[PDB]
Short mmCIF file of C-alpha atoms and ligand atoms in Angstrom, two decimals:
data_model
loop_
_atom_site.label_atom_id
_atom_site.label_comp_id
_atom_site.label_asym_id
_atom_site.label_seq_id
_atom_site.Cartn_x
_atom_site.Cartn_y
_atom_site.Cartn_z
CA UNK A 1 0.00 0.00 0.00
CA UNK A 2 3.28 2.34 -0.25
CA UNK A 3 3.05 5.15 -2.81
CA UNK A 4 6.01 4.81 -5.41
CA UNK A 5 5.43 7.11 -8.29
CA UNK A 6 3.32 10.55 -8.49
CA UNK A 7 2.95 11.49 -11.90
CA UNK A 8 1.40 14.48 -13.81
CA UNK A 9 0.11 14.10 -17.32
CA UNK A 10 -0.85 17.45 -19.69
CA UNK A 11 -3.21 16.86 -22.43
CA UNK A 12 -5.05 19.42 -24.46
CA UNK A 13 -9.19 18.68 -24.01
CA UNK A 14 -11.75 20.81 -26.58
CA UNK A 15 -13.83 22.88 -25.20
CA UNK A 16 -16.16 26.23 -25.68
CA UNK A 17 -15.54 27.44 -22.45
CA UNK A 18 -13.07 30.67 -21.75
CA UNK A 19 -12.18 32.54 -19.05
CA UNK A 20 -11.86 36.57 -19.28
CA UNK A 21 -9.06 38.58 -17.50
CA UNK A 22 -10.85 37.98 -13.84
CA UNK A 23 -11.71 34.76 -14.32
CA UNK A 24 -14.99 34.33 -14.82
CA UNK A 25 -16.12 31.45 -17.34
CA UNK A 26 -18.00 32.49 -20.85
CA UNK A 27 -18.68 30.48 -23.97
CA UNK A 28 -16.09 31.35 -26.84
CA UNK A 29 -14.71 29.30 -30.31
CA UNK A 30 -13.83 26.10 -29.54
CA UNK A 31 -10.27 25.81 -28.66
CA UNK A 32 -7.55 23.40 -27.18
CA UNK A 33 -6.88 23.98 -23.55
CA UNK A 34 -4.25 22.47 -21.78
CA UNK A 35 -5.49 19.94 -18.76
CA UNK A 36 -3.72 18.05 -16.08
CA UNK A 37 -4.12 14.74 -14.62
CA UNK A 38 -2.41 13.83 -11.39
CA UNK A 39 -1.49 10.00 -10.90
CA UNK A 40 -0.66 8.39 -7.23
CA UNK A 41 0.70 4.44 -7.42
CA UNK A 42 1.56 2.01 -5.09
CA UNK A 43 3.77 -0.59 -4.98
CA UNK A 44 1.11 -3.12 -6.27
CA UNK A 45 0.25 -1.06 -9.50
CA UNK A 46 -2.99 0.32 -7.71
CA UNK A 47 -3.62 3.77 -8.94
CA UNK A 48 -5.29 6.98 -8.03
CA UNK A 49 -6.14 10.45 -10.47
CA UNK A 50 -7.83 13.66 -10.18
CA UNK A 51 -7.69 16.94 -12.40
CA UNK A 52 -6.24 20.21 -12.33
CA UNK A 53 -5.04 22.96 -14.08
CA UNK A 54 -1.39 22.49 -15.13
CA UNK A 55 0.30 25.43 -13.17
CA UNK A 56 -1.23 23.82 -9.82
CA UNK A 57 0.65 20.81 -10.01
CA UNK A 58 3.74 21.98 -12.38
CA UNK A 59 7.09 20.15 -11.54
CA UNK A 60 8.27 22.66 -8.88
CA UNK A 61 5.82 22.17 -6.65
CA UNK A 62 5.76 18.43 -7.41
CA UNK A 63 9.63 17.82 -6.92
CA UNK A 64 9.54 20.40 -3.81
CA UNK A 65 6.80 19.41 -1.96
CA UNK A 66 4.08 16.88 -2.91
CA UNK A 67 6.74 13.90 -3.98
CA UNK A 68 8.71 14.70 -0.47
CA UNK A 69 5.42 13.98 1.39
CA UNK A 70 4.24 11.11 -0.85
CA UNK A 71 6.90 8.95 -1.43
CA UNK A 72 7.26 6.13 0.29
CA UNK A 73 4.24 6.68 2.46
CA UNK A 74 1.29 4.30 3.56
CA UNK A 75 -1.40 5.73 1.01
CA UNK A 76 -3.97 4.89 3.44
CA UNK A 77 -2.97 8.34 5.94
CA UNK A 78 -4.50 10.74 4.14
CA UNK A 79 -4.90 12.23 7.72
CA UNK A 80 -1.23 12.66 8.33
CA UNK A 81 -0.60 13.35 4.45
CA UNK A 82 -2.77 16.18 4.51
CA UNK A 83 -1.82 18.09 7.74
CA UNK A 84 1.92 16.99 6.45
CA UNK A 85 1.41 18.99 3.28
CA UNK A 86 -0.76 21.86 5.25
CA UNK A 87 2.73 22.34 7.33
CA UNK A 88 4.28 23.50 4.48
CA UNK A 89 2.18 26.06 2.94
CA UNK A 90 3.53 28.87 5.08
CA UNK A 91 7.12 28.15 3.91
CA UNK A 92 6.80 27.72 0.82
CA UNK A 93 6.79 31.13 -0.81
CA UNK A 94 3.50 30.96 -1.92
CA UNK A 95 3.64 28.25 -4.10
CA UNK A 96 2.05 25.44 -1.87
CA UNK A 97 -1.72 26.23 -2.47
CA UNK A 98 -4.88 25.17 -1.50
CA UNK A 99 -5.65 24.35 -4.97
CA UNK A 100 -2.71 21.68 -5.08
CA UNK A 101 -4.09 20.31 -1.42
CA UNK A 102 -6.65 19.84 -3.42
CA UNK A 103 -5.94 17.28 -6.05
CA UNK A 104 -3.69 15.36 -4.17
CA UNK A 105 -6.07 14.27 -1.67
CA UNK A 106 -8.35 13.80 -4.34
CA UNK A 107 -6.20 11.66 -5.94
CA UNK A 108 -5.48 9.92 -2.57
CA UNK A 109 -9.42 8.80 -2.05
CA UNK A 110 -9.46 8.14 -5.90
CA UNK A 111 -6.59 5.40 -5.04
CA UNK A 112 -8.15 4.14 -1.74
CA UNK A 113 -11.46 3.84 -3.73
CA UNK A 114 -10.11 2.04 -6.62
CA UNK A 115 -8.21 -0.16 -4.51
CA UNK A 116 -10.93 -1.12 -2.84
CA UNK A 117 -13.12 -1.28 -5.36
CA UNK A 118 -15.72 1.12 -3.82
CA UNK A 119 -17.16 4.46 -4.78
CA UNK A 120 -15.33 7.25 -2.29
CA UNK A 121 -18.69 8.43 -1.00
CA UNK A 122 -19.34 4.76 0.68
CA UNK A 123 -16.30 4.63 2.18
CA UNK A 124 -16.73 7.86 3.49
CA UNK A 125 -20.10 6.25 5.06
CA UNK A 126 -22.96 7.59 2.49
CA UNK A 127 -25.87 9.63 3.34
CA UNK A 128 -27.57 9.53 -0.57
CA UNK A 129 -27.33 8.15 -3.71
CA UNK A 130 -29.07 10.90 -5.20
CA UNK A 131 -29.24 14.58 -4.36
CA UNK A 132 -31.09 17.46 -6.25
CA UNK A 133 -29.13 19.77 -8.28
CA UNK A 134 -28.89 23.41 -9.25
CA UNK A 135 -28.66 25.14 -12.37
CA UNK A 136 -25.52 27.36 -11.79
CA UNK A 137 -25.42 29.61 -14.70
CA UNK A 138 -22.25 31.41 -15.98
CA UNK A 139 -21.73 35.17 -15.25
CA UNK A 140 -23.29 37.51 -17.57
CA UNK A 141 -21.95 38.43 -20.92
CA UNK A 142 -22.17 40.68 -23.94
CA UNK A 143 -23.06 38.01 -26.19
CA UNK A 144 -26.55 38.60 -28.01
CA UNK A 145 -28.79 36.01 -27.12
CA UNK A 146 -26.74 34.56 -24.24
CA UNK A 147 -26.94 36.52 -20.83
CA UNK A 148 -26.48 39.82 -22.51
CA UNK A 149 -29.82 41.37 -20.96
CA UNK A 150 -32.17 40.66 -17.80
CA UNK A 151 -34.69 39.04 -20.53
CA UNK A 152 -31.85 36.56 -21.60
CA UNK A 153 -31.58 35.44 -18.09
CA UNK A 154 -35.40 34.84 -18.14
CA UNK A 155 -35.44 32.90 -20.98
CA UNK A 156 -32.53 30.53 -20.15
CA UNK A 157 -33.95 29.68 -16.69
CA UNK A 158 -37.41 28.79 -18.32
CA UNK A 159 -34.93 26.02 -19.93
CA UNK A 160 -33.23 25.01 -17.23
CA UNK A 161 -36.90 24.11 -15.48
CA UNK A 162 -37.95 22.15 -18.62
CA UNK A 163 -34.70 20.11 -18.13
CA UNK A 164 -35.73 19.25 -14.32
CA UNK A 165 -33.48 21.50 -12.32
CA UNK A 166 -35.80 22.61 -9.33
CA UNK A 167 -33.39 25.50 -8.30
CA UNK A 168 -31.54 27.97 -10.56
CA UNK A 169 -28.46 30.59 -9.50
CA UNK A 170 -27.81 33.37 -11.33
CA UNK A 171 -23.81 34.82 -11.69
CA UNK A 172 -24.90 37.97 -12.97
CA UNK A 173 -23.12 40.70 -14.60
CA UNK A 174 -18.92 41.45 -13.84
CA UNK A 175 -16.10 43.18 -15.38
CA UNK A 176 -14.54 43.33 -17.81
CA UNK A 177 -18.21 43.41 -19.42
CA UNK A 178 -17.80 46.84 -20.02
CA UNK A 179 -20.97 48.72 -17.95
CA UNK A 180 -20.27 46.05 -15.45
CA UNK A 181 -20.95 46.02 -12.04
CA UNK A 182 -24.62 47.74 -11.61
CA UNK A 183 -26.60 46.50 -9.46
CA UNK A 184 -30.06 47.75 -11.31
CA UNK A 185 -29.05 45.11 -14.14
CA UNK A 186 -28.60 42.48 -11.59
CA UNK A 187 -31.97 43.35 -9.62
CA UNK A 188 -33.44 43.42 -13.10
CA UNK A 189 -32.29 40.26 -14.48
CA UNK A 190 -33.34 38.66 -11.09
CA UNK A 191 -36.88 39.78 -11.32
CA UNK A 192 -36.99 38.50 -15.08
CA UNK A 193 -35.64 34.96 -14.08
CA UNK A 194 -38.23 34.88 -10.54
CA UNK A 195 -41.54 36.47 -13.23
CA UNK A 196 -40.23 33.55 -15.42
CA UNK A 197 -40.63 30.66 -13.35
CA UNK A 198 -42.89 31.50 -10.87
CA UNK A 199 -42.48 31.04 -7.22
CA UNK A 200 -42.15 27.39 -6.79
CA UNK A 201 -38.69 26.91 -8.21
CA UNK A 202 -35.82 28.29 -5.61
CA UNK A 203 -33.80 30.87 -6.91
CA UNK A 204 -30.18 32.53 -5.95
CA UNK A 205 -27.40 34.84 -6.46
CA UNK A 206 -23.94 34.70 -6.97
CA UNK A 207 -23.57 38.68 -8.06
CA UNK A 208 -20.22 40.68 -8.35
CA UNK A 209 -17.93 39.63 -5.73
CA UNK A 210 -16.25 42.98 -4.23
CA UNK A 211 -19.60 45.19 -3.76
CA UNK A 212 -19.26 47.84 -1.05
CA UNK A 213 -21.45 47.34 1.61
CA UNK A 214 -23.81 50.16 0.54
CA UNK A 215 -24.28 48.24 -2.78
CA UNK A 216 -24.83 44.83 -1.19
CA UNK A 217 -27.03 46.29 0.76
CA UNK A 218 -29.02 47.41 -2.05
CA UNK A 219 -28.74 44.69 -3.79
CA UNK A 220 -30.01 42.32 -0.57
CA UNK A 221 -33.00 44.82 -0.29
CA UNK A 222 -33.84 44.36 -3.89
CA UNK A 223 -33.94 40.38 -3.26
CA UNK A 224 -36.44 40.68 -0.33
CA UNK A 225 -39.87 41.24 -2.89
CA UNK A 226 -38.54 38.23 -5.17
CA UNK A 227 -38.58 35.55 -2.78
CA UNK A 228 -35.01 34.41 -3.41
CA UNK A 229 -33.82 31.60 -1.43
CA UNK A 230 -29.96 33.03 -0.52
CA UNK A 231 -27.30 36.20 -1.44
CA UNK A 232 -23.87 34.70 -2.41
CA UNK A 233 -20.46 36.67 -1.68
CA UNK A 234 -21.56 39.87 -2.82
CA UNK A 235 -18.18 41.33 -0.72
CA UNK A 236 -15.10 41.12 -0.61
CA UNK A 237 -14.99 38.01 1.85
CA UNK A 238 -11.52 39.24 3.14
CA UNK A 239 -13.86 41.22 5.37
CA UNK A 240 -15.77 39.32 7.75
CA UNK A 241 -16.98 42.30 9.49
CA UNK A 242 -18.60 43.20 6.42
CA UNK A 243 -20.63 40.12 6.30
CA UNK A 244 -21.42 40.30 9.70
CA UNK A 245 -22.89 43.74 9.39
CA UNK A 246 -24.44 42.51 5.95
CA UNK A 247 -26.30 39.82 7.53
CA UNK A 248 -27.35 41.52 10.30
CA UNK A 249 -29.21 43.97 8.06
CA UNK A 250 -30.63 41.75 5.09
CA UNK A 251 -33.84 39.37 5.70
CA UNK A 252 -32.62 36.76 2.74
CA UNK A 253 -30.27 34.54 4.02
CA UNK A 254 -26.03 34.67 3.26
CA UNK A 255 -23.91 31.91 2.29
CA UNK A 256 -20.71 31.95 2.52
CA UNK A 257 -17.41 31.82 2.79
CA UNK A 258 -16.83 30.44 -0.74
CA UNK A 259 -13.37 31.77 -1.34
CA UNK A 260 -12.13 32.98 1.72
CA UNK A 261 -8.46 31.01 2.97
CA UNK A 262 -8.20 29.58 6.07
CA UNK A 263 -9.82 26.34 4.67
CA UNK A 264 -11.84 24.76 7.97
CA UNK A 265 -10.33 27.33 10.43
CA UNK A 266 -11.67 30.17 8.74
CA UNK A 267 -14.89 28.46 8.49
CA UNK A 268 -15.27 28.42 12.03
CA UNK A 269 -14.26 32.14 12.49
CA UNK A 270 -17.71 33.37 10.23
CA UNK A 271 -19.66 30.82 12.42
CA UNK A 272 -18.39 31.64 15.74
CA UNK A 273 -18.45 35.77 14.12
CA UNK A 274 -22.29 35.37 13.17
CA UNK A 275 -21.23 36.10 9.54
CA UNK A 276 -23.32 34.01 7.30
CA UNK A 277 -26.73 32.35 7.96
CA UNK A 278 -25.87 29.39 5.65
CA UNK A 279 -21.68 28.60 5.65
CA UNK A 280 -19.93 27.25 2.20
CA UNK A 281 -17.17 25.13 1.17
CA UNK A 282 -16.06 23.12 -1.34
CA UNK A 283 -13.23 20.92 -2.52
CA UNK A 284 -10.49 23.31 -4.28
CA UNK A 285 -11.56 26.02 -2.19
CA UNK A 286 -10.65 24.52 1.11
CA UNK A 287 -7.98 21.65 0.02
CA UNK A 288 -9.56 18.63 -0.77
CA UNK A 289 -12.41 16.02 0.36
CA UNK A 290 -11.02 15.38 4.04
CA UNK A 291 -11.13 19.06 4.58
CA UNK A 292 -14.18 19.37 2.91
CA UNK A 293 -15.69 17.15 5.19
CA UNK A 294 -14.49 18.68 8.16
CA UNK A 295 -16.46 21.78 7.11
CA UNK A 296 -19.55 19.80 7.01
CA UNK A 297 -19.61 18.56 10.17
CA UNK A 298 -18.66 21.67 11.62
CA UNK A 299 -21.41 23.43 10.24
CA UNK A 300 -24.06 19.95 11.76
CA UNK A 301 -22.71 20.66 14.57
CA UNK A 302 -24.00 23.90 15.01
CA UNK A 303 -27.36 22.92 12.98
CA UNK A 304 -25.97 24.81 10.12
CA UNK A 305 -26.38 23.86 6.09
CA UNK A 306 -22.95 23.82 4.19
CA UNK A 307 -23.11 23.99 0.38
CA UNK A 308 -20.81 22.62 -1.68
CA UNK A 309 -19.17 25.07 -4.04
CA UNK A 310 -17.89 23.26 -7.72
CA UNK A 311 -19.25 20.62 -9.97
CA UNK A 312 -17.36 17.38 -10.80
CA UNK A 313 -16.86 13.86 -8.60
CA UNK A 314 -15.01 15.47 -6.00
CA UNK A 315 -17.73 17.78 -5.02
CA UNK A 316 -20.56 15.15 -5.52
CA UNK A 317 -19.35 12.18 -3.60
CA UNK A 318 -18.59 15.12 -0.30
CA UNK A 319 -22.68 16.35 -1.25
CA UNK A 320 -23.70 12.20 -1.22
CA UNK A 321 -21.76 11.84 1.84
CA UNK A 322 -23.25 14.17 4.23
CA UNK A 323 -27.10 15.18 5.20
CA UNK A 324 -26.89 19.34 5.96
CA UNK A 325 -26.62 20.35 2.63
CA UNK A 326 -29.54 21.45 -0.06
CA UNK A 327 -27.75 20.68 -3.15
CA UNK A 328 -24.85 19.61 -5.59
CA UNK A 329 -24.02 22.52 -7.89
CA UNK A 330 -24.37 21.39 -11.54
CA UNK A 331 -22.55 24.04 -14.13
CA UNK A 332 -21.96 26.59 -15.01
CA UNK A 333 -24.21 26.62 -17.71
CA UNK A 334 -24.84 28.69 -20.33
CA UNK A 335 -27.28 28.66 -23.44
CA UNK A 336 -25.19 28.39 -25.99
CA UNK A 337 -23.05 25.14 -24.58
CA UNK A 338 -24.71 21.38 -23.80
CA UNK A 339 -23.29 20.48 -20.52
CA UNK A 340 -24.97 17.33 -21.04
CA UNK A 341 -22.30 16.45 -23.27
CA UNK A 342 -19.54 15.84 -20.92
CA UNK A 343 -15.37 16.00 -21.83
CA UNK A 344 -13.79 14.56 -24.15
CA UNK A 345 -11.49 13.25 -21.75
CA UNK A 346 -14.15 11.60 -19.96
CA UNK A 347 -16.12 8.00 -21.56
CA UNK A 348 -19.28 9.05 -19.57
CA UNK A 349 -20.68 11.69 -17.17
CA UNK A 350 -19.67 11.96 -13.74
CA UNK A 351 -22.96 13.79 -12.35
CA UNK A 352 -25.77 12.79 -14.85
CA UNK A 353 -28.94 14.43 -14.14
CA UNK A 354 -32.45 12.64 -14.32
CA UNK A 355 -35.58 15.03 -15.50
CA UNK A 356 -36.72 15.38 -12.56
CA UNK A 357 -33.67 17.24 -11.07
CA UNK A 358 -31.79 14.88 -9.32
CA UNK A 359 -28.33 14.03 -10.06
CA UNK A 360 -27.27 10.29 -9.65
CA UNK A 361 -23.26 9.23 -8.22
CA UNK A 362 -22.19 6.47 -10.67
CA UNK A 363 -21.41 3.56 -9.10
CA UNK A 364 -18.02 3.53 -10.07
CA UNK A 365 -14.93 3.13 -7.63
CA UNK A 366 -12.93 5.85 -6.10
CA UNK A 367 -14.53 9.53 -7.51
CA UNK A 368 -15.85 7.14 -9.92
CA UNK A 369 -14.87 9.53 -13.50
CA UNK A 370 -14.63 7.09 -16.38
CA UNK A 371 -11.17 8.14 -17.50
CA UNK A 372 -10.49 7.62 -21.41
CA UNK A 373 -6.90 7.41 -20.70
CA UNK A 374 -6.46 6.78 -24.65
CA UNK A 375 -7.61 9.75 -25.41
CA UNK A 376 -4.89 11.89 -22.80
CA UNK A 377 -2.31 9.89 -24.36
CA UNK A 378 -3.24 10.80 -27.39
CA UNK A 379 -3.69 14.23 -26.90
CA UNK A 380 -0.58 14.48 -24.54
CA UNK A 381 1.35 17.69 -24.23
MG1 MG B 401 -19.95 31.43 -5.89
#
């Protein structure tokens, strides 16, 4: 069960999907994009992977930290692998991130799964095979016909119900769209979205992530006559005071932290500081499934829902595996791409959705993603 080899493989997978100078995901021309896969093996052949971008697990942070910590190590201690790797982050010039505690943990339950021959959400002890999903849509854009205007919103989330999803977020409009932020347009493009699909289905937002407080504020108040079911990080969540205060004054509930540091620790900090009515994690954001996990209890503990932030297997099998939270978030979507579809690095999906909104875990071993390993190799970088 000792780890001897931890190797990274870049391929380039197809896709439509771009990300502008912040960061934020739109649809574009299709295009080649260059993809990571991180591979764990022990000394029986037994092998674990996960994804990532290439710059989170490029060879200096491989030879420099994650192979010193690996190496020669039960696989099985993903306890003392993780707080091993966590040691180093404040040494390591910045380089050790979250986002690489990420994917080699993932990797790590992908390998005890496999080995085992069991999904990683029934090992973790599983709560459901089936949880209700989400339509996260992408952040507004300029495109005509996509999520240019409030009305485009409307229209997209009247297709999103016909598909099954029985809740719907909105990422509304952010630079560098160029009249981006206002929060009129978002409050606007709410109210088409809520006028479109009535009050049954749940409804969020996800709008522009540094508002002031006197924005947020307006934007919160705006939410109040449209029934919405939760505000997401519409601050800067460097500043918890801010959220305290924000919460304090809106009605609709606030999740959060989604991208806040601190992983777990920091967690605790907006729940002891009264910050958020509804707390948030998720897999890259605070290091991987184990941590994950520890954010979910935490938040039971206190009788306190945790939403998981982030599609793929790694997200889903933490959502299957616990009881206090609503949903698995399935995107983002957008009207002019079929998420449906899948990757072409992938043989089949790893969250398929029935029409009635609820997303099934395969019943595949470890994060259970049907790999088409011929397909990296022969797209290899
Ligand atoms: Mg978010």
């Amino acid at each position: 069960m000792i780890i001897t080899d931890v190797e990274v493989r870049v391929f380039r997978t197809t896709t439509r999907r771009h990300s502008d100078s912040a960061g934020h995901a739109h649809p574009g021309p299709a295009h080649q994009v260059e993809q990571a896969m991180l591979t764990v093996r022990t000394e029986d052949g037994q092998e674990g992977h996960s994804f990532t971008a290439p710059e989170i697990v490029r060879p200096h942070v491989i030879e420099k930290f994650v192979k010193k910590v690996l190496i020669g190590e039960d696989h099985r201690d993903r306890e003392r692998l993780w707080q091993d790797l966590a040691h180093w982050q404040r040494g390591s010039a910045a380089q050790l991130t979250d986002r690489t505690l990420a994917v080699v943990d993932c990797a790590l339950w992908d390998l005890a799964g496999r080995s085992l021959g069991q999904p990683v959400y029934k090992l973790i002890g599983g709560y459901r095979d089936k949880v209700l999903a989400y339509g996260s849509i992408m952040c507004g854009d300029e495109l005509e016909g996509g999520l240019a205007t409030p009305e485009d919103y409307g229209r997209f989330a009247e297709t999103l119900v016909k598909r099954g999803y029985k809740g719907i977020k909105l990422h509304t409009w952010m630079p560098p769209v160029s009249w981006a932020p206002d929060v009129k347009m978002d409050l606007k493009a709410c109210a088409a979205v809520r006028e479109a699909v009535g009050p049954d289905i749940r409804l969020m937002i996800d709008a522009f992530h540094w508002y002031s407080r006197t924005d947020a504020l307006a934007l919160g108040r705006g939410l109040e006559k449209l029934g919405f079911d939760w505000i997401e990080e519409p601050m800067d969540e460097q500043s918890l005071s801010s959220y305290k205060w924000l919460s304090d004054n809106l009605d609709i509930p606030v999740v959060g932290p989604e991208s806040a540091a601190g992983k777990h620790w920091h967690r605790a900090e907006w729940i002891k500081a009264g910050a958020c009515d509804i707390l948030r994690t998720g897999v890259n954001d605070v290091g991987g499934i184990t941590p994950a996990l520890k954010t979910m209890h935490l938040a039971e503990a206190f009788g306190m829902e945790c939403e998981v932030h982030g599609n793929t297997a790694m997200n889903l099998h933490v959502v299957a595996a616990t009881k206090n939270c609503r949903w698995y978030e399935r995107g983002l979507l957008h009207p002019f791409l079929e998420y449906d579809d899948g990757h072409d690095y992938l043989k089949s999906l790893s969250d398929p959705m029935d029409r009635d909104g609820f997303v099934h875990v395969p019943d595949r071993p470890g994060l259970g993603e049907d790999i088409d390993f011929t397909f990296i190799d022969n797209n290899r970088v």
